Amino acid sequence: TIFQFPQDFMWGTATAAYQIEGAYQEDGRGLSIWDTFAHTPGKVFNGDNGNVACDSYHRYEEDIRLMKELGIRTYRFSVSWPRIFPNGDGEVNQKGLDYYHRVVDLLNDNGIEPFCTLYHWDLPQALQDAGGWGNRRTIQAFVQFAETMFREFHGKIQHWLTFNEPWCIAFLSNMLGVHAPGLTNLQTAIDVGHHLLVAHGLSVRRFRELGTSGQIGIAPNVSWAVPYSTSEEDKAACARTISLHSDWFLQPIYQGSYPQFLVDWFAEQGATVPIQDGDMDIIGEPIDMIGINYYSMSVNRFNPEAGFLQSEEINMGLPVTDIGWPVESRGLYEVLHYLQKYGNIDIYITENGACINDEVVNGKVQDDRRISYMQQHLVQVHRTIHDGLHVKGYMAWSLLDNFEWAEGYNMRFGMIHVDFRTQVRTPKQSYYWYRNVVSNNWLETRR
Amino acid sequence: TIFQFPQDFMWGTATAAYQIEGAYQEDGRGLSIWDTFAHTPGKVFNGDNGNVACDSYHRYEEDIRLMKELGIRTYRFSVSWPRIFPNGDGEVNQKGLDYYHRVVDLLNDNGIEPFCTLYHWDLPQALQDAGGWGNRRTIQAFVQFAETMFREFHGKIQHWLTFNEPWCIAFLSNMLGVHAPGLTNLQTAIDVGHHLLVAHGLSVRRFRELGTSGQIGIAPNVSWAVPYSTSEEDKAACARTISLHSDWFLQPIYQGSYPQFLVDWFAEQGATVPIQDGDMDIIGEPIDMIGINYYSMSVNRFNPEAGFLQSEEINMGLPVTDIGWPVESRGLYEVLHYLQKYGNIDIYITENGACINDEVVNGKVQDDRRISYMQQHLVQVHRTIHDGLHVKGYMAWSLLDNFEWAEGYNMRFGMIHVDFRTQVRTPKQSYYWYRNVVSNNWLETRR
Amino acid sequence: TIFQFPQDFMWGTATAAYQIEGAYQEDGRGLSIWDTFAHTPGKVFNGDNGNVACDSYHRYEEDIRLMKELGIRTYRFSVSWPRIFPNGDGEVNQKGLDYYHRVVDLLNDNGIEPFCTLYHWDLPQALQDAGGWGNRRTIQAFVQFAETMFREFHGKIQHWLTFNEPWCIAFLSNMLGVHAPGLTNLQTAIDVGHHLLVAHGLSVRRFRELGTSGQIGIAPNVSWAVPYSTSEEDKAACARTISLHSDWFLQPIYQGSYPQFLVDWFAEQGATVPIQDGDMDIIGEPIDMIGINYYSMSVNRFNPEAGFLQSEEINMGLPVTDIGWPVESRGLYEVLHYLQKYGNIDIYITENGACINDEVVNGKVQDDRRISYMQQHLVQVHRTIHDGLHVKGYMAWSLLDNFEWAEGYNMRFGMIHVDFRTQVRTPKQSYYWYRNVVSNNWLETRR
Amino acid sequence: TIFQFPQDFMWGTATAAYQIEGAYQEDGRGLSIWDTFAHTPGKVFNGDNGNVACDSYHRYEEDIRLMKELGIRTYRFSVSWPRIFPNGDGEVNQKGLDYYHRVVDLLNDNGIEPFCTLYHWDLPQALQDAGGWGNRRTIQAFVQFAETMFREFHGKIQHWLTFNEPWCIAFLSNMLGVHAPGLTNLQTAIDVGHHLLVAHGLSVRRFRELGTSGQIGIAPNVSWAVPYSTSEEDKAACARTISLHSDWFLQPIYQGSYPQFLVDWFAEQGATVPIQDGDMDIIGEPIDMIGINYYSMSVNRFNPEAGFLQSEEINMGLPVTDIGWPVESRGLYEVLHYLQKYGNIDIYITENGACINDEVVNGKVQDDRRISYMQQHLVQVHRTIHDGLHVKGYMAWSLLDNFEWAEGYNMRFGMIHVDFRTQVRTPKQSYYWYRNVVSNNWLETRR
Ligand SMILES: O=[N+]([O-])c1ccc(O[C@@H]2O[C@H](CO)[C@@H](O)[C@H](O)[C@H]2F)c([N+](=O)[O-])c1
Ligand SMILES: O=[N+]([O-])c1ccc(O[C@@H]2O[C@H](CO)[C@@H](O)[C@H](O)[C@H]2F)c([N+](=O)[O-])c1
Ligand SMILES: O=[N+]([O-])c1ccc(O[C@@H]2O[C@H](CO)[C@@H](O)[C@H](O)[C@H]2F)c([N+](=O)[O-])c1
Ligand SMILES: O=[N+]([O-])c1ccc(O[C@@H]2O[C@H](CO)[C@@H](O)[C@H](O)[C@H]2F)c([N+](=O)[O-])c1
Ligand SMILES: *[C@H]1O[C@H](CO)[C@@H](O)[C@H](O)[C@H]1F
Ligand SMILES: *[C@H]1O[C@H](CO)[C@@H](O)[C@H](O)[C@H]1F
Ligand SMILES: *[C@H]1O[C@H](CO)[C@@H](O)[C@H](O)[C@H]1F
Ligand SMILES: *[C@H]1O[C@H](CO)[C@@H](O)[C@H](O)[C@H]1F
């Protein structure tokens, strides 16, 4: 079947600073909570870390030349906060700013629109030392960071995102302890989530006050769970799973309150949202779009022993990618329609991709399963657009094989293979497949 | 995840006469419409036919020994009508009856319950010569065939099905011309469908009058289509696709009328159901269960040019089996719940399986994709039972690689590989996987 | 180096009933706790069980022909208690006795000395229903079982063992829950251990009173741990690890008391040995030899969080077999010298072998790592004999690939490969290597 | 298990001049006894020699760039005596000095601490012509060589070793004839050993008098033998084996006498140590640390026919590296504790590695057995540190595949593969494994 995309559909790829850049000590870069985390034995597989990574601090010109031949129109990347403010400090590091000017000017030179993520998880350790996100002073620190970027790159960047995946920053990181700073305390995860939201609202307010160029949003990762039974309990468990990812952050922003179930759920667990006067108004600051990050879908049932959400995922026997995630693309269609409760808002898919670990064989990377994955999910994108939803663009995750957080370098998401021994880039078969789709601006599924 | 099945859950496998038996001219067997069809150039791939097939006319003792070591409780097979009545004639062939007594006694000897399909597509050619199913005299001919079987095998067979897949017999065979007798006429397909239904009702009536042992039903193949858009037209197109397979046959049987939309749809195309006084009452004869035959699911949209149902299937990019069908097991869960409109009736899954063409390599058939397929679909079966639906059993399609109708021998569905050059059986890896599940009476999905 | 063994050194192989026999419901066999355990979802990998196994209930004549061409002098096997007393009942099953007469007469016919293990873990479920080993009535039940065997096979069997691996029966099974009946209660594991010992003493007493032919002992599995540090705590942790396997059972038998440290350790955990008047005298019944079961060695340190013995094993980086055990044969030499605290007693190595999962390739099983393993351990055997220790024989574990308890059939220990789909035996390369050693009665290590 | 190393633990790699440098005739280099030896038919396998080798005389900048990306803190190398004094002559060769200034300045430029071995076996042939090490005039010649180096490289080198492996220089070379100059005379081996020791003491005395920068020691290779029996004779044989490597050189240095047993043993063989007045005082000159060179461990027994030490090694069946040595890392732990008889002295492991002959395949060297070897031995290092022993650093043997003395180029020890046809370096998989360990400063053993 032929799937023709809109003329002005925005095709891109996405990375994050700590996952690709390397040069973790170079040019006065301070340490982030992820440096600290990855430098701690037992936290990241094999003790991998983002010292070096893809060395994109030095190799960005090649990366941009490769993405320019991909025929892509955006590039989503994030800013290393501790390159700009090494202690989250108000003491600016000009060399850090100079790096992003080099990147952004190259992008703009190549007709590729920067899509800037300000926060992709690298809180300066200095700020974490004071309580980092659980401390409201970090709010003010973020707003200065954001403001500095808005002022420096005014007119060079037209698409901004405050935070990438608040659910991970808050709950995966501070309740489940899986990501830096690796805490396991409900109240702290709720505190972090709330303060992210206030810092987000204040940054969007500053954006507006400054008259900064472009449009600004936030990029939640988005859950989809479907009940095993037709029971009310299984239905409830899926609602909790879905809502904590998206609604818990999106209902404040759009509708001015946290999801009351969940507030009630967490209250049963003795945790309350630290809401201060004025906070909810700040958080409801109008935004221009959202980014949605999507990989997977699950079938869940109520289980009292299944974690703090008491929602158990059933292994339905589906095939899985090389990191263990089932592929079921309908979940993207379902959650995009779900999110229309907030209106027909502008949505960019700011992360979608698969861990497929194929290496270079006879000079190429025959990653047919990544093509298959992307094909399936791009059909759903077309499908939602054709239902009239304002889905504006799609960013493949990831340009490059990179540091996959707690999995280290073992789990490859790139459309370009990186040999971490040599730093040699080898575009995979999915890169050429994707080059054709973005260039043609249509997709064909064939037998 | 562990999926524990009911204590009295009925595990089996399924074949059909013309697909396995061979000996097509032996012991006075008359020709069927499928002999004729497969003997016609251009109808079946490579000119394959069911002369010989798996030679199960001669090798049934081995087949039963193999299925007995599978640990199975039923075996679904069909009766070759032209072995019993070579001209559909009232002139019985005792040698034909003797074959099925040999099979049935062996099954019963082995503690394996016969599950008898009377009609699995092999209408005597003699009857087709007079109009075959479009001629009401074929109704009377079928009822005598059914009656003969009820009388002969009374007390040896406790599970009966009148017809396997009426949609195929009627629409695939007489509208789309794909299966014998290969006609392309809407009115004839509707005539055939109606007369099958009357012949079904009359046979169930005779069953009851005779006091034959056991329970009797009918085994539709079951469609599931889900709309591409949220549009009313796409929704309509899926409704037509779903209903022609199941409702068109099941609404007469259960509720006493054909689906009125569809009646109206076909009337626009100038075809009317040849309903005679008393017909609908006959068809509404109470039955004890149904068999459901399921493989696949589709995403459809309205398309004026997409065949007589104007319903186009979208290639969504899903992986497909070796015959080209996508695997999406949720469709089984969905259609089973759909069918509850007729009440919580007893349902056996009387056909589910995958075309996976792996051959013997180092003495085994490493058909991991067939295991994967079956795993997925057995989860859904468990899922519906746990929703309280009366799903009573599951028959894997197929015991043996066999004659796959218009595809010939090219398309292998068996859990046991058959080398058609030698007739050597080699149980595939899925056979041993299935032996464990049926024996344990639980399934585990693992990473 | 050449290693010449004593003229009268006893070479053999070893199996256990539930691991090889199959026919779990045949001839009135009752269910054991391992039938129950393996039939419980989640207990054994893949839901494997010992229904069928190697089908040695039917195929014992082939097995004996194969072991007879191995040139072996003993065969260690165990008696399925529930074949003899299906409810542990006093109601004898003659068909069960007849099986072991068939096996034993064949062995004796072939000049192969039976080495009979009475208890290799298959307690009748009927007895477990009353508390099984935690209930002193099971003591009396075992003594009748033992007595029945002594009386029936008097003069046909000259080597007897009461219990195989008391540590597993007691602590692995009732404290760690890993083996049937899968309990996790210190007091119950101590109760079980104590009652095994009383049942052992009473059986040896009956043996003597009856004048039964031959010699009788018990076959502990034997731990060896060596401390990571030179610290007193690490030394203590290794002492606990070593002593619970051997001394906890051997000090009662030889010296008339339980190891006082350990008694004190378990008392801190609120568990006491249920010692009744007369018990310790019973347990100290003189025995003729012991069997030692050995696989592996560990380097341990004190760790408060490392289980009920607070003894942590360090992964020292050694290569491991396919079940994950490091090979360090010196541990056999060390523990044999350790056990001289009980005097220079007669010791048979009644189990030593490796899980090496090589399959049949070009008609053979090239299990070089199993040869390597056995070579290393047979050097140590020679080494202890040459130090003057009365090590009398060696039984390779196992004749056949078999049901490896909680690992199921996945973990192969056999010197003969069994295809569980066909039951075809294929002697591995280690079988022919071993045939040469036992026949020559010397070993050569070569570069 | 995680094994965290001390913050200031010194990671390195090690080479020797004649094994890597090549340019054997360049820049006025005189011939050494190893040039002569390797140029003699029958002495070195295949007639390989150290003309050319790794050509590190020319390629040192690449080697240093590679070791700098390894993240290493030291580099142990040796000085070619005949580059500096071609006839061992007092006539200095400035071009020879200039080479080591180029190397050392590059190392220092790269933040890599030189660890200088003065004598790694390349005695000028001119000196051997006069009796070479058996002649006391060679003592004086060495002290001038050492003094020249101390004076030239003062302040550029902070770690010095006088002699690498005195046991090899003396006994392997002059008793067993295996290494240059290939003599077989006990008295000459004892003479050589004694004179090495005097030359060592005098050089350390000069070091002190000059006020040279850094610390100075000597680097014995270290034997470990464990007795086959518990017999006094086997115990004696192991004591001789252990002591001739270490104690025979270390007891003079630390305690002021040769091991009296051994003195007595050699006296029975008619050889006496040529001790002159003042000699033992000279040899007892205080040193700052020792280097320990370790590969392997053995199980030995007394055998009258087993060489001049009458100590036979038993092939215990252990797997071996590609040069034929068994790997048993506990020997490192054992001998380090053994050496505490001299006090808790500072010990660097100045050579540990494995001959693993894997070549480049698909662009990499998959030397998993070298990683396994190093893993095992680094656990023991951690283990001794944690026992409180002052083990200060670890140098992998070897940076590069090189000339392995009598084995020639056939036996590869490198962490970087060298194609001797092209001189192309290819870092092996162990190089990247090691880069991670040294950089993280911890090791993890995993299943
Ligand atoms: O420059 N400033 O003085 C300043 C102060 C507080 C600022 O922000 C304030 O920071 C507090 C924590 O210190 C938070 O509790 C308040 O919610 C936030 F409005 C900002 N800002 O966000 O733009 C700026
Ligand atoms: O034996 N008979 O005389 C006889 C006749 C008509 C019979 O059946 C009749 O057959 C007609 C066609 O010939 C159909 O039109 C009728 O619907 C059917 F009742 C049956 N029967 O179905 O049992 C039996
Ligand atoms: O036949 N009998 O009457 C009989 C009774 C108790 C017997 O044994 C007794 O059994 C008791 C449990 O019922 C245990 O508490 C005693 O320790 C045991 F001596 C035996 N026996 O072991 O030979 C035989
Ligand atoms: O420069 N010198 O005149 C000189 C002489 C002898 C020297 O050393 C002497 O050499 C003798 C052999 O010629 C040895 O027998 C003596 O043991 C050694 F002290 C040294 N030195 O070692 O520094 C220097
Ligand atoms: C979205 O998911 C990918 C894959 O897990 C991560 O690598 C990104 O950092 C995250 F934003
Ligand atoms: C159900 O489907 C299978 C596969 O197409 C056919 O072979 C059977 O005959 C049909 F009843
Ligand atoms: C000794 O160990 C082996 C291997 O785990 C088991 O299979 C035997 O049953 C046990 F007695
Ligand atoms: C230590 O051993 C290695 C391997 O045999 C040699 O190559 C070195 O030169 C020696 F110092």
XYZ file of N, CA, C and O and ligand atoms in Angstrom, chain A residues 135-141 143-144 147 198 202 206 276 279 282, ligand 1:
88
model
N 14.738 19.825 45.162
C 14.982 21.121 45.794
C 14.469 22.210 44.855
O 14.850 22.242 43.695
N 13.568 23.067 45.320
C 12.993 24.070 44.434
C 14.029 25.043 43.849
O 13.801 25.654 42.798
N 15.200 25.133 44.468
C 16.232 26.026 43.955
C 16.731 25.586 42.583
O 17.087 26.421 41.744
N 16.549 24.301 42.290
C 16.868 23.736 40.985
C 15.920 24.281 39.898
O 16.336 24.507 38.751
N 14.682 24.584 40.284
C 13.739 25.235 39.379
C 14.359 26.521 38.838
O 14.499 26.712 37.630
N 14.799 27.375 39.752
C 15.346 28.671 39.397
C 16.604 28.493 38.549
O 16.825 29.223 37.577
N 17.405 27.493 38.912
C 18.624 27.152 38.184
C 18.322 26.727 36.748
O 18.999 27.160 35.807
N 15.586 27.589 34.995
C 15.086 28.731 34.255
C 16.223 29.634 33.773
O 16.179 30.124 32.646
N 17.285 29.778 34.565
C 18.430 30.557 34.096
C 19.137 29.860 32.930
O 19.634 30.515 32.015
N 16.839 30.319 29.923
C 16.941 31.723 29.528
C 18.243 32.031 28.791
O 18.217 32.598 27.710
N 6.973 22.955 37.221
C 7.068 24.380 37.546
C 8.205 25.031 36.745
O 8.029 26.099 36.151
N 7.799 28.080 34.015
C 8.581 29.318 34.144
C 9.472 29.597 32.938
O 9.576 30.734 32.483
N 9.323 32.747 30.433
C 10.471 33.557 30.028
C 10.605 33.623 28.509
O 10.913 34.678 27.957
N 2.523 24.473 45.719
C 2.519 25.770 46.390
C 1.623 26.758 45.650
O 1.342 26.578 44.463
N 1.682 27.689 41.776
C 2.334 26.621 41.019
C 1.502 26.144 39.831
O 1.988 26.096 38.702
N 1.405 28.605 36.983
C 2.676 28.583 36.266
C 2.703 27.411 35.273
O 3.037 27.575 34.105
O 16.766 35.804 39.354
N 16.039 35.608 40.319
O 16.164 36.268 41.345
C 15.046 34.572 40.243
C 14.600 34.130 41.475
C 13.646 33.137 41.561
C 13.127 32.574 40.418
O 12.187 31.596 40.403
C 11.717 31.049 41.605
O 12.694 30.191 42.172
C 12.236 29.618 43.419
C 13.346 28.759 43.929
O 14.533 29.499 44.195
C 10.986 28.797 43.160
O 10.469 28.319 44.403
C 9.912 29.629 42.486
O 8.820 28.787 42.091
C 10.460 30.312 41.258
F 9.508 31.212 40.704
C 13.590 33.038 39.181
N 13.086 32.493 37.926
O 12.624 31.365 37.899
O 13.135 33.170 36.902
C 14.543 34.030 39.107
